[model samples]
Target: GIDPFTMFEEINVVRAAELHRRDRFDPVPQLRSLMAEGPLTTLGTEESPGGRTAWLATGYDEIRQVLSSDDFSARLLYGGTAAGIFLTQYDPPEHTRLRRMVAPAFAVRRMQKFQPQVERVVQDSLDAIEALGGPVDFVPRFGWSVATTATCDFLGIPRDDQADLARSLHASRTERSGKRRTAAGNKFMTYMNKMTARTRRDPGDDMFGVVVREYGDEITDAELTGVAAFVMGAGADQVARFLAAGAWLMADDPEQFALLREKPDTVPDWLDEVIRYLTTDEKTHPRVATDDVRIGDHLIKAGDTVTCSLLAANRRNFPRPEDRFDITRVRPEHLAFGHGIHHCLGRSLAELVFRTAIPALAHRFPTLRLAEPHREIRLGPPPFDVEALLLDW
Candidate 1:
């Protein structure tokens, strides 16, 4: 009998497709079977670019080790049109310096200051939902609208331009066809360049302007454009997906929704649980091994592409990994924001957006129900986003 975790050529096609579209193809049972082999396993060879072997780090501790370890390089193995000065593509010292320059803009104190703006955006979305009447598609109207507004507000993109940018960014990130994605990317970059130039000229009070004022001349114009585009592109649909997915999670479980309604203070904890439960992406950006490293009994050689399965890691080493979606379960720190030096910088902003927007929707439409069953709702690939969330209040 072949080992389920053995690197099989048959699975190479599956892996190749996963790089572009992150949907697991609902292979949880197969994943559980392969995960049983050990904390670390190989996913066959010639499965990724350069005919390289792929390793899966599924255990929580193992995944964390790969994430935090200096042995793994931060360079991406895949190419994309959206690829540019991404912070995730850099290792320490360089990554550290660049991140520090961008960090202050997303500081906790600053997020607190932006809370009112966040609230207003959420309120406006809710107001529109109400005015549009019942049987609304929450995905575009509320979810995308509120998230895009908050992120653009943080980036200093004009309010009027946000909706169009949001749509563009979504396509640029999610388009399966590389040509279309590249075209969208070209358009977005052109727009970002113009926006960055405006920020450089005026140096307003927003995040973009703040970066220009503080780090002016320290980073290149390309670097500035990349950072701005990455932040906007990164946060745009991701938060929308979470908001939309979290809504489904709540809509599916009325008891939990009522619990949240009654204890508003616990929203943060609830959201944390939801984040862990979702584990948004099965794997994050793949990292290449910088040196020979031992994870379990397997030795990952230099230049081998290693992918940490966040979904697998999130579920492992728990008392009961069987209960996949327990919102109240006390679990370990999850890989939702990733780990180590590359941990998500937008975490605070993401949480703030969720806390402000999620509760607002819940309160406004206390009786909100899914027009279609949860099973009918469609999510596209990795960072699963609801395609059409027909909801009624």
Candidate 2:
């Protein structure tokens, strides 16, 4: 048995994203090298190596267990009144209850009904992109518009406030922690709170109204505001990032791009491959062990903090080599949307957005290609999105 106090050397839990970025945006090769050493690795400082070590689960099954198991608590990691109420931070019955209350809004059937709305949003974005009529940054110009519009509209944000809220949401993801980030979070919470209050007075049919009508006084205003802010804030940019990256990938890979252009039906599977291959999430919210947890050959004692690398896990356990981006290839199970109880609540909505947007963009702009050479394309920090993906159509 390994001593919990003397695990491994010099790993900063907060710098995982920077490490991946430093490794040139692909962490798998490095992750594979780490996994070659063992399934469970340690992260901490060298001075007191294991004094504050955090466990990193690298294997597929172990990562899944860490996600699903109650032995690891989710509550301790999150802070801020509004952000803390996110379902991802809750465990068991509390999580189950909150999830049930909001589940219907994100149901696949309900999301499919939004397809026409999704199409309209995508088309509108394309029109805006076309109006630019030359080299354009697709991320802000089109991708953000599609994602922000769809998500905010679904949440029942009035059209007038949608763009500002979207801007705040993006800031909530990208901005450094400070007065700006705090103010942005407060603004989002305030907006959600105001909308919830309005929905209570006279219910409309959007997600906010539905939650107000269904749950009513049973759910607290703070909880409602928190959930709403989190859903809107957390959901918006990831889809936007995915769109920009997916478009760039498809354009860069001519063979795949041709297949997507020729066979529209293949777009869905191709998008799945894109999601798996990219695995946009930088890191999982750290999980604290509430009790002794055994992951593979390693034993994680109660109170140890364990974080799984979704990027690494997605790259593990594949039918084909995980590195190859093959649209036609049978897809493998991935942690892209996460695993277990904390799996993404907005997954259906995301899928719908991708399904509607990717094909629509491909068809509308048949000649869409990168405006700049590959090396020149840069990714934004924090969330690590394409800084400005210049596209030529």
Candidate 3:
């Protein structure tokens, strides 16, 4: 465990975004400096049965080990807080079963079927952004909207209500410390309660219907809703941030940007790089030690909360920055989507959607550029965070 010499620097991130929210624009250099130099850290406070907890892991290899092992637990639902199905937590048999029930639908074959839809959505969003004519908070107005619409259509949510669901999911993920987290979780439960009922009653041609029909009596309404929430919650925010970040990264790095434009295939590689760079899920994927586990020099005890540093692992250890944004740079063993039995179920779909959507975006908006200097853009910290990602072409 690499401890930050100081706590304030460790906790400065949350406040930085809040300040960005206030300033509306800050220098990119200021934000960039912190991430490059500061310790991989967090600031969390749990009450009663729980006390304050902040576990830090900064090195790449260590985070990978933590994510792959059962030492740090993500099943915080036991904490009686906001959480979705086995997606955010759970290990082995249970996680395996849920992932199996849902995996077939998100298979690469199924994802291929969605490419056309993905391109259509991406193009339409870019067109809409172009129609805006001038400076805009590219994140909320476009990045978030397109990702929400694509996900809703893919998941078979009402097209009209996709934005509403996106907003709610954001609210759920964003209220990191308060009653709002519980409230958001309950709201999702209620919505999924209704959503699952319809899914069960009228087995449609959507993923929800598949989970309801395929899982049969094996899955309860609560669990079914949990599945839906998992997909929606995971799908929307990260993809949106990723899209915004992709654009941001390209605008800032001309050499890499030009290569992606010339090669075209490089876009996919760039998307992966941006994802690696962004490490949107800043919080380590927590796992609870089932037994004693050794991570680097540290011997983690059973029942201890351990986290996988997806960001650190990818950056510290991932080979090759060749062409920087080249989408083909996908290492056979990257930890971006996680590792082992707990790997992300929607990865194929996410890849299909992202690979198709991002390039289509570049092709459609050839002149796309960040409207504000990097310093002025608003970026949030971890999980669900971003105030603005403004762009123009």
Clashes of each: 3, 1, 24
lDDT (Cα, tens digit) per residue for candidate 1, span 1-393: 766444433354256335334232233555676578898877667545555577777788888889999887765453321333288777778898898888878888989989999999999989998999988888888878887788889888888888787677778878889898988878888898887888778888788777778887776678877777776777666788888877777676667767677775655467777777666655767787878888888878877767777777665643355545655555435788889999888999999998888778778877888886644767675556568888887
TM match of model 2 to true structure: 0.86
lDDT of each: 0.74, 0.74, 0.60
Worst 10 residues of 2 by lDDT: 4-13
Candidate 1 vs. true structure, TM-score: 0.84
Off by over 4 Å in 1: 1-27, 46-52, 79-85, 167-191, 266-268, 317-324, 330-332
TM-score of each: 0.84, 0.86, 0.74
* Model 2 Cα lDDT, one tens digit per residue, 198-269: 888997878877777777777778877776676666687788888887777766776776777798575556
Q: What is the lDDT of residue 148 in candidate 1?
A: 77
Cα displacement (angstroms), candidate 3, residue 232, comes to 2.4
Candidate ranking (TM-score, best to worst): 2, 1, 3
